[PDB]
UniProtKB/Swiss-Prot annotation, chain E:
Induction entry: Expressed in the late phase of the viral replicative cycle.
Subcellular compartments: Virion; Host nucleus
Signal peptide: none
Protein role: Major capsid protein that self-associates to form 240 hexon trimers, each in the shape of a hexagon, building most of the pseudo T=25 capsid. Assembled into trimeric units with the help of the chaperone shutoff protein. Transported by pre-protein VI to the nucleus where it associates with other structural proteins to form an empty capsid. Might be involved, through its interaction with host dyneins, in the intracellular microtubule-dependent transport of incoming viral capsid to the nucleus.
Residues represented out of the complete protein: 2 to 100 of 942
Name of the protein in its database record: Hexon protein
The organism's taxonomic lineage, starting at the top: Viruses, Varidnaviria, Bamfordvirae, Preplasmiviricota, Tectiliviricetes
Family statement: Belongs to the adenoviridae hexon protein family.
Note: All late proteins expressed from the major late promoter are produced by alternative splicing and alternative polyadenylation of the same gene giving rise to non-overlapping ORFs. A leader sequence is present in the N-terminus of all these mRNAs and is recognized by the viral shutoff protein to provide expression although conventional translation via ribosome scanning from the cap has been shut off in the host cell.
Subunit description: Homotrimer. Interacts with the capsid vertex protein; this interaction binds the peripentonal hexons to the neighboring penton base. Interacts with the hexon-linking protein; this interaction tethers the hexons surrounding the penton to those situated in the central plate of the facet. Interacts with the hexon-interlacing protein; this interaction lashes the hexons together. Interacts with host dyneins DYNC1LI1 and DYNC1I2; this interaction might be involved in intracellular microtubule-dependent transport of incoming viral capsid.
């Protein structure tokens, strides 16, 4: 890509970063246990679909909960605003005073990438020195043919 | 109407920056170190100095952090495989140490 | 007004802090991992030749150092905790051919060509804690040699919002906000008045009737309009001072007063970060002219 | 516009969900308007009474002129609405929610000709299958950057 | 320290630490030079030898106090109800020059 | 040395004040009103000269109060004494515990202090929301003296109410009762680091001054002062070669 | 600000009207607030009744303690407001209309 | 359509005019002061001698 690497790890000026770029379109994510872990450590953990979210997804607890102020109880309907202003039980607090994946939260580490491709470079040093490669020019690829998988 | 017309409270602002006078003649940038530094009346017999300020009332305890600029240069002398040494020098203020 | 003086940066919408505070997690707890580099002025660009070289550095823990906060409050009072599982030293070498290699050292190991590294900031650091009411701040420097001296780059900074470097820690710092003394999130700088420079107590620099006031560069005119004359720009700046941050800066000045293309104006700039304000009587003046004026609290 | 040059791109905030949640300050209410001369609806009537009586020291007396007025034993009507999230909910609830794969949505009981000749690639179903409200609303991993 | 030599950190100094003398090409190993350029198309090294700038310290600026700036006061004003003429006068110092 | 980073990797709770969101955590809609508990509005007895032998005669020092403010909800068929059935299969389908026909479950008195709604969390106890200590109570005010059949069915039980990320201002009173101290919508805080990990590594600390150095001549060649602002340099040198407004 | 440099320009969206119309999702309502211990206004009163009677199998009975409570035969008051356009209407209705 | 033809610039959200209309004051009255230059095609770059 940016021939930056063997002696410097900086964001080669976007002047070499328009669209099909690797850096800008490069997105790094991170998120904790959205059930506060499975049924193992966290002493009182659980799962709750739709026909049971403690109130619509905004099951938001430590506040007016949610229920009744939005849609009602009935499973996926999303229409009239019926309901019962009753406290919820999900999403367990994962900060504040309460919260702790036994010792502390678990970590779901993922990253992202769009508008780009992947590209290995048929070469020696990995960087761009020529249009066609010192690898292509090569007689062991010039000489007797080969094969590949 | 401030009798005739409104009074005016004129203020200005500045963030993410510093202040910097330039030890020089014309005020502009011509060289890294100054024609002022190069100068023998600063080359010749030493001197002394006092810079005073007049801050705007400051609520609690506060500082200043003053920035005097000089080359904090160095060098690296690799002689023979596995074996080194970092020279060292800055001026003015070459590691001022005196009993 | 009742806000000019606080660290904005230490705000909640500091989109950066709003950012960096996630590549970790929304749970006060992160089983992290990261790659932190060094920046020691004298090596970042060093290229060592064949044959091992011992190495040792040290991490810190004070939660009011190695951790930022939107609201900015020591996370020790609420013992935040960090614990380094394990750490190493990664290193990416350059598959440098060998004859070739044997060459660069053959050379790199020369006297003529001893590398060197000079630091960008380029300057010393002194710390004069002002009182907490004082207005002038006398800094009588002593005698000595000033050869090479560039000049004076300077800005004020809170007390609590700046630490005194030295030992491992300092059982006194109780703050998780920002250190402009370490990010330049300066905001306490235009609170300056004058700045007298005295060499040998008899001669002044620069003197030579340079400024319409050369016994001290001026930075502003007292609240009640008095120096409306040497104000300028439509801000409190003196036609004198504007021409400094406009001189030692964009070399534009002696024959043109335009905004040198921002191409020379990124962050620590003087123009863009330069903000000019204006406002009338918020009580419509005190009890004097305005025939029926008044004050009203909460 | 000539070369119909106009690269395709979504809305940042939407793809990679960014959840500060929202933020509200003062519960701002809407209040009973009432043309103008009013403002409050729920309110009884009270007559203008005095005490100045010719023959009585400590006691009140009613006058003669006004015997009907609009007022109230409280203030003026209102109904909180935390805009702050409302739009937010009306934001997930419309940029990712309703933009999910019919493989995590669900058709509604009471359609007329949907799917009759239609499929999940035809507007009808395509735009007639309820999603799963309960799947991505306001309190969803909140405080964490986690594009659904 | 009120104690300092009329020649502390001079020439040989600005010399050793690439603070003066010749730029990197006027001092870098002749062959060092080649490769430097002969592979910079992919191996950054265009720093590890700094070419200290420097400035002229002669016949540029003045020594005798001059005037960086002058505020001119009018001589022939003349206000009216929709106009405002203003007669200024301006001199150019012998050995002085303006733009 | 351009290719040499210190690869951290470890653990660290952000403390108790890391509020990675804006204001309110849970519920953000429904106002600063409340859920549906137990109405207990009554001053109560006093401590004065009253019930004596022959000194002074005392009237009545009693004023019990155990009402319960609430709000009906779901709909079901008849509401006899056997709870109620929102359906009908092979027999009277007694409504579930987490929900029993008309009306719904309600906060009991055992709940350590009552708070408003826009401030209410209670951790779950069954993969479908449900707790314990559930008690019912039927209602019927219109007592004409004929039918005693109720119409409502409240399920009063205690929950694990609290408020880790919610703080109010001035509660109704000071006494710890079923009033409503209801602390709510705490102040948000993002805990992290500084651009280019400023601080992190001790720089300019002679004591904790780093130490690269050879073996063959082992002399440390790195010695910081307390004037070599290190952080501020790098962060200065970065905007310069590229807009510090970057997101690497 | 010096040279009062500040070219004149309107708001894109306004000159060349761009009409996606608007877009709304869930009808969000405002609801009767009522200090706190309430939430709903329109609601009758009902007394706590039981059945456990000493001499009756199938029939209810009234207790003695509570004879007044606030509730309702519905839910809690509201009034839709499709913000989505409201502001929009309050947008054409103020940037081109009145202009 | 019934707008193509009017000076948009002369709009209220002309952020510039929204701007320049303050380095003075929000009070119809400003005890001002300013530095206005010239631009006469034939001097702006003139450098007069002694």
């Amino acid at each position: 890509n940016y021939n930056y690497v063997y002696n410097g790890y900086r964001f080669w000026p976007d002047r070499h970063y328009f669209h099909y770029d690797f850096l800008r379109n490069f997105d790094p994510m991170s998120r904790q246990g959205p059930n506060f872990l499975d049924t193992t450590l966290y002493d009182l953990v659980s799962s709750t679909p739709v026909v049971n979210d403690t109130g619509s997804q905004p099951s938001q607890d430590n506040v007016r909960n949610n229920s009744g102020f939005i849609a009602p109880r009935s499973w996926p309907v999303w229409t009239a605003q019926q309901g019962e202003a009753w406290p919820a039980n999900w999403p367990y607090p994962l900060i504040g005073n309460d919260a702790i994946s036994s010792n502390q939260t678990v970590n779901y580490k993922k990253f992202l990438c769009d508008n780009y491709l992947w590209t290995v470079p048929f070469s020696s040093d990995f960087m761009y020195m020529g249009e066609l490669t010192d690898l292509g020019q090569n007689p062991m690829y010039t000489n007797n043919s080969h094969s590949m998988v | 109407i401030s009798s005739n017309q409104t009074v005016n409270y004129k203020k200005f602002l500045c963030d993410n920056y510093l202040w910097t006078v330039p030890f020089s003649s014309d005020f502009m940038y011509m060289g890294e170190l100054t024609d002022l530094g190069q100068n023998p009346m600063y080359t010749n017999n030493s001197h002394s100095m006092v810079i005073n300020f007049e801050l705007d009332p400051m609520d609690e305890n506060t500082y200043v952090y003053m920035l005097y600029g000089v080359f904090d240069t160095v060098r690296v002398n690799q002689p023979e495989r596995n074996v080194l040494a970092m020279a060292y020098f800055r001026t003015p203020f070459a590691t001022g140490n005196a009993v | 007004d009742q806000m000019d003086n606080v660290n904005p940066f230490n705000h909640h919408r500091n989109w950066g802090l709003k950012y960096r505070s996630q590549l970790l997690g929304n749970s006060r707890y992160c089983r992290f991992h990261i790659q932190v580099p060094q920046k020691y002025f004298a090596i970042k660009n060093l290229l060592l030749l064949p044959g091992t070289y011992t190495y040792e550095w040290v991490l810190r823990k004070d939660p009011n150092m190695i951790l930022q906060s939107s609201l900015g409050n020591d996370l020790r009072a609420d013992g935040a905790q960090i614990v380094y599982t394990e750490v190493n030293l990664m290193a990416n070498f350059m598959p440098m051919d060998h004859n070739t290699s044997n060459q660069l050292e053959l050379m790199l190991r020369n006297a003529t060509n001893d590398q060197t590294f000079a630091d960008y900031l380029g300057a010393k650091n002194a710390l004069y804690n002002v009182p907490a009411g004082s207005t002038l701040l006398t800094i009588n420097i002593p005698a000595r040699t000033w050869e090479g001296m560039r000049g004076w780059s300077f800005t004020r900074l809170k007390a609590s919002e700046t630490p005194q470097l030295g030992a491992q820690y300092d059982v006194g710092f109780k703050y998780s906000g920002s250190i402009p003394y370490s990010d330049g999130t300066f905001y306490l700088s235009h609170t300056f008045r004058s700045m007298s420079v005295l060499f040998d107590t008899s001669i002044n620099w620069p003197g030579n009737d340079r400024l319409l006031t050369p016994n001290l560069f001026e930075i502003k005119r007292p609240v009640a309009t008095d120096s409306e004359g040497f104000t300028m720009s439509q801000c409190d700046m003196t036609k004198d001072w504007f021409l400094v941050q406009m001189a030692t800066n964009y070399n534009y000045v002696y024959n043109g007063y335009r905004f040198w293309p921002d191409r020379h104006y990124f962050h620590y700039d003087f123009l863009r970060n330069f903000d000019p304000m204006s406002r009338q009587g918020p009580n419509f003046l005190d009890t004097t002219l305005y025939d029926l004026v008044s004050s009203t609290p909460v | 516009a000539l070369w119909n040059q106009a690269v395709d791109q979504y809305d940042h905030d939407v793809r990679v969900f960014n959840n500060d949640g929202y933020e509200e300050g003062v519960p701002t209410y809407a209040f009973l308007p009432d043309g103008h001369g009013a403002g409050e609806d729920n309110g009884p009537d009270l007559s203008n009474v005095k005490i100045y009586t010719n023959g009585q020291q400590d006691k009140g007396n009613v006058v003669a002129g006004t015997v009907s007025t609009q007022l109230n034993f409280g203030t003026i009507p209102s109904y909180e609405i935390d805009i702050a999230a409302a739009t937010r909910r009306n934001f997930i609830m419309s940029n990712i929610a309703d933009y999910l794969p019919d493989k995590y949505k669900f058709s509604i009981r009471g359609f007329d000709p949907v799917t009759d000749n239609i499929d999940p690639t035809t507007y009808f179903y395509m735009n007639r299958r309820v999603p799963l409200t309960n799947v991505v609303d306001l309190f969803t991993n909140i405080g964490a950057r986690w594009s659904v | 320290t009120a104690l300092t030599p009329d020649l502390t950190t001079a020439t040989p100094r600005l010399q050793y630490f690439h603070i003066a003398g010749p730029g990197t090409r006027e001092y870098l190993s002749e062959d060092l030079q080649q490769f430097i350029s002969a592979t910079g198309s992919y191996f950054d090294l265009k720093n590890k030898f700094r070419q200290t700038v420097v400035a002229p310290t002669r016949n540029v600026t003045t020594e005798k106090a001059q005037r960086l700036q002058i505020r001119f006061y009018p001589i022939q004003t003349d206000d009216t109800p929709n106009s405002y003429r203003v007669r200024y006068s301006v001199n150019v110092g012998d050995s002085w020059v303006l733009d | 040395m351009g290719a040499t980073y210190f690869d951290i990797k470890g653990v660290l709770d952000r403390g108790p004040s890391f509020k990675p969101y804006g204001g309110t955590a849970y519920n953000p809609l429904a106002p600063r009103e409340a859920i549906f508990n137990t109405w207990v509005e009554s001053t109560g007895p006093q401590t004065n000269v009253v019930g004596q032998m022959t000194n002074v005669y005392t009237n009545q020092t009693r004023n019990d109060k155990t009402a319960t403010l609430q709000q009906v909800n779901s709909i079901s068929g008849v509401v006899p004494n056997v709870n109620l059935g929102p359906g009908l299969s092979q027999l009277a389908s007694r409504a579930d515990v987490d929900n029993i026909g008309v009306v719904g479950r309600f906060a009991k008195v055992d709940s350590a202090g009552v708070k408003q709604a826009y401030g209410a969390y209670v951790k779950p106890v069954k993969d479908d929301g449900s707790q314990s200590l559930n008690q019912t109570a039927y209602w019927l005010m219109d007592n004409g003296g004929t039918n005693y059949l109720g119409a409502l069915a409240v399920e009063d039980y205690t929950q694990t109410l609290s408020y880790p990320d919610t703080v109010l201002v001035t509660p109704p009173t000071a006494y710890q009762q079923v009033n409503s101290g209801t602390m709510r919508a705490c102040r948000p805080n993002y805990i992290g680091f500084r651009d280019n990990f400023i601080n992190l590594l001790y720089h300019d600390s002679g004591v904790c001054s780093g130490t690269l150095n050879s073996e063959r001549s082992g002399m440390n060649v790195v010695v910081e002062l307390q004037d070599r602002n290190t952080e501020l340099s790098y962060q200065y040198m970065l905007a310069d070669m590229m807009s510090r407004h970057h997101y690497f």
